[PDB]
Design an enzyme around this catalytic site. Sequence first.
Site, mmCIF file in Angstrom:
data_model
loop_
_atom_site.group_PDB
_atom_site.id
_atom_site.type_symbol
_atom_site.label_atom_id
_atom_site.label_comp_id
_atom_site.label_asym_id
_atom_site.label_seq_id
_atom_site.Cartn_x
_atom_site.Cartn_y
_atom_site.Cartn_z
ATOM 1 N N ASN A 120 -7.821 1.650 12.567
ATOM 2 C CA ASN A 120 -8.570 2.506 11.640
ATOM 3 C C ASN A 120 -9.805 3.108 12.280
ATOM 4 O OD1 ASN A 120 -6.728 1.629 9.744
ATOM 5 N ND2 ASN A 120 -8.276 0.773 8.334
ATOM 6 N N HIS A 156 -3.860 -3.288 7.802
ATOM 7 C CA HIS A 156 -2.574 -3.978 7.798
ATOM 8 C C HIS A 156 -1.874 -3.950 9.162
ATOM 9 C CE1 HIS A 156 -3.443 -2.824 3.617
ATOM 10 N NE2 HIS A 156 -2.799 -3.930 3.283
ATOM 11 N N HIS A 189 -5.242 6.072 13.000
ATOM 12 C CA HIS A 189 -5.457 7.116 12.004
ATOM 13 C C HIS A 189 -6.823 7.040 11.326
ATOM 14 C CE1 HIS A 189 -5.005 4.581 8.387
ATOM 15 N NE2 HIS A 189 -4.201 3.872 9.156
ATOM 16 N N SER A 207 7.409 0.212 15.737
ATOM 17 C CA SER A 207 7.464 -0.530 14.486
ATOM 18 C C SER A 207 6.252 -0.272 13.578
ATOM 19 C CB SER A 207 7.648 -2.026 14.776
ATOM 20 O OG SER A 207 6.725 -2.485 15.745
ATOM 21 N N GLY A 208 5.576 0.855 13.775
ATOM 22 C CA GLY A 208 4.715 1.433 12.739
ATOM 23 C C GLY A 208 3.220 1.209 12.848
ATOM 24 N N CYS A 262 -2.824 -1.156 11.624
ATOM 25 C CA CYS A 262 -3.246 0.101 12.211
ATOM 26 C C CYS A 262 -4.627 0.035 12.835
ATOM 27 C CB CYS A 262 -3.184 1.209 11.170
ATOM 28 S SG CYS A 262 -1.479 1.705 10.802
ATOM 29 N N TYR A 274 0.838 -1.188 0.000
ATOM 30 C CA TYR A 274 0.000 0.000 0.000
ATOM 31 C C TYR A 274 0.876 1.242 0.000
ATOM 32 C CZ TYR A 274 0.908 -0.152 5.090
ATOM 33 O OH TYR A 274 1.510 -0.205 6.325
#
Length: 216
Positions: A194, A190, A174, A169-170, A192, A156
């Site tokens: 959402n 993936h 959001h 690590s991300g 996150c 993505y």
Amino acid sequence: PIPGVASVSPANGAVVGVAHPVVVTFTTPVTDRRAVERSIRISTPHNTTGHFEWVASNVVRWVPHRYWPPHTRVSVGVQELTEGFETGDALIGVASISAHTFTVSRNGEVLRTMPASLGKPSRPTPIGSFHAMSKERTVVMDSRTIGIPLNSSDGYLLTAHYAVRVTWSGVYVHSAPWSVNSQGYANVSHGCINLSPDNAAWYFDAVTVGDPIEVV
């Protein structure tokens, strides 16, 4: 021979959330970790306990067990440096993988239970006790920064908003307009957390760096 301190976080006089670690960065890699840990003096009125974690060769953080109290002072001394910072409200966000929800409470009072979509089973949101690490109004979500080539099926590249970093690590919370239909019903991200644009914006406006984010 002990390495010099490069920085301490939080900065002096900051008002942070109640899961903010005390992070001490050194000018070289640390060989004698126990000596560095003994050198770091943390004091708070409630005598909060906790533990050190080495997150880089030259970076150690002290993580308070069960959060700092809200609206408290914390003093920090290491080598020649001393500082003080404070906590604000206890603003706790709980992201539930099973319930598909993100619930935010201020000082025990539940403010919103928001529809959320967390990571799909193959790209999951990690269970754990985290804190808000940063606030970015706009951020490029790039799958290459979590080890996934753009042409792969899980690839993505997109710009997201109201982005709050949860893990080193991300993982972020959001705004995800593309998954609004899944939010509250299914986990399709993936990794996150959402939220809808409006819920992400509300959270983004409410949150302080250090605020606890629990994934359950």
